[PDB]
């Protein structure tokens, strides 16, 4: 009818219907936080607009926008400040396209043990889309970035209900901002951005967690220092170590802003307790990382005792989900299936889950028990 239960404690959620969306998992209403049912990820490598997850921090999201009047302001340490219309962006700059995953920093938080506060998400706060727009590099070049610039800040039309609450503003290094991959996206899967995915313009930051992908983007400021806004200084911090992790229950001694994705993979065509026919069993799924390239995906049907090489599907780009397929011989009985990816710089997935106080960056090897008969 209208609820689902996610596979962790206090997992009940409403299935909710928003304009332009299929039924999604409602986490919060004000502001909207909507998660994608896991079944979607087996339906194709590109997440449809009507299924794409939604995350916001502040209730004052825009609900009326005149696209003709909309302006993107470029200001700060630039030679010529700019006020660009959507028509200007579409017409005055050559377009770029990239197929890229957007994933919430806390995707899978609900599975973290011990549990931690925050958005209690299963694995559906991620999606893959074909984004089209203007490379940020081109717009900043037009403005003329000044020597001494260090960072670029990004803000959108949303705001807090009470003005003392910190506005949602994020920052990138100037060298990242001008790398040619960071994009001012005005199109998602060949359409104007869905409302809750940041209509009419958003920042796309391939290979970086979603907090940077500022929606309803209208203000870009080039600055000559590190930005000290709340959402960079205090929120979205990870431990400053290789594992981005601490001993369960312990705070990090040093932190840095969250940044690039770690390596993840999932089996998408079976879930816990699924039935398969003993014999050769086809498995399939996805893998992704921070944009280095998935080198291989290995699949196990005996809880990681032995591994089989999956065949990777043709790629859509280094920032996309990478599809994979494997056919494994399964004897009659229960089997714990796992998949484990590695990328082109040797990053991989841990067999045992790690922990950090915010419950960010989960990427443990996923296990799925199936029944072969």
């Amino acid at each position: 009818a209208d609820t689902v239960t996610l596979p962790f404690a206090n997992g009940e959620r409403p299935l909710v219907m928003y304009p332009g969306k299929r039924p999604l998992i409602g986490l919060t209403a004000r502001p909207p936080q909507l998660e994608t049912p896991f079944s979607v990820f087996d339906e194709g490598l590109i997440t449809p607009n009507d299924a794409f997850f939604v995350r916001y921090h502040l209730a004052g999201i825009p609900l009326e926008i005149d696209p003709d009047a909309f302006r993107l302001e470029i200001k700060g340490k630039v030679g010529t400040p700019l006020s660009l219309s959507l028509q200007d962006l579409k017409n005055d700059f050559p377009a770029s396209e990239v197929v890229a995953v957007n994933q919430c920093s806390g995707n899978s938080r609900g599975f973290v043990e011990p549990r931690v506060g925050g958005g209690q998400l299963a694995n559906g706060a991620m999606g893959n889309a074909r984004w089209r727009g203007v490379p940020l590099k081109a717009v900043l070049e037009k403005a003329g970035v000044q020597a001494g610039a260090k960072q670029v800040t990004f803000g959108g039309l949303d705001g807090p209900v009470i003005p003392e609450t910190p506005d949602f503003v994020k920052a990138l290094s100037i060298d990242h901002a001008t790398d040619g991959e960071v994009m001012l996206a005005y199109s998602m899967n060949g359409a104007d951005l869905p409302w809750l995915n940041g209509y009419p313009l958003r920042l796309v930051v391939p290979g970086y967690y979603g907090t940077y992908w500022v929606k309803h983007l209208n203000e870009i400021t080039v600055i000559d220092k590190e930005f000290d806004g709340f959402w960079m200084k205090t929120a979205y911090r990870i431990p400053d170590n290789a594992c981005a992790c601490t001993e369960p229950g312990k705070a990090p001694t040093a932190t840095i802003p969250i940044n690039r994705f770690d390596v993840r993979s999932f089996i998408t065509n079976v879930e816990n307790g699924a039935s398969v026919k003993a014999g050769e069993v086809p498995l399939r799924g996805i893998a992704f990382d921070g944009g280095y390239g998935i080198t291989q995906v290995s699949v196990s049907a005996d809880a990681g005792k032995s591994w089989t090489n999956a065949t990777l599907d043709p790629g859509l780009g280094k920032y996309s989900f990478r599809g994979w397929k494997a056919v494994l011989p399964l004897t009659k009985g229960d089997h714990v299936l796992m998949c484990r990816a590695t990328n082109a710089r040797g990053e991989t997935q841990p067999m045992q889950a790690t922990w950090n106080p915010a419950g960010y960056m989960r990427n443990v090897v996923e296990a799925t028990r199936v029944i072969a008969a």
Binding site: A9, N10, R13, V16, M17, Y18, P19, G26, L27, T28, A29, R30, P31, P32, A59, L63, E64, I65, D66, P67, A69, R115, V116, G117, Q120, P160, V161, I162, E164, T165, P166, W195, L196, Y199, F230, T234
Partner: protein, 81 residues
């Protein structure tokens, strides 16, 4: 004309309890966001967890909640969720 977007009706509510913190939470904790933020947190987390949530709202997000209400609310949440 501009384009517009319509959100569905909000229905999220706090779990009733006889503790006075229930009413205090109703009157203070829905002012910035829906109460599904509370309803969906991990279960049975206990006093320290909920004390810290309430204090964060007050100190970090500037929720205008006084000391007595802050305690009533945290106590209600720790007992109820």
């Amino acid at each position: 004309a501009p384009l517009t977007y319509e959100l569905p009706d909000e229905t999220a509510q706090l779990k009733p309890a006889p503790q006075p913190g229930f009413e205090a939470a109703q009157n203070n904790c829905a002012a910035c966001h829906s109460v599904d933020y509370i309803n969906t947190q991990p279960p049975g987390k206990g006093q320290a967890f909920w004390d810290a949530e309430v204090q964060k709202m007050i100190k970090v997000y500037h929720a205008p909640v006084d000391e007595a209400d802050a305690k009533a609310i945290a106590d209600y949440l720790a007992k109820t969720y």
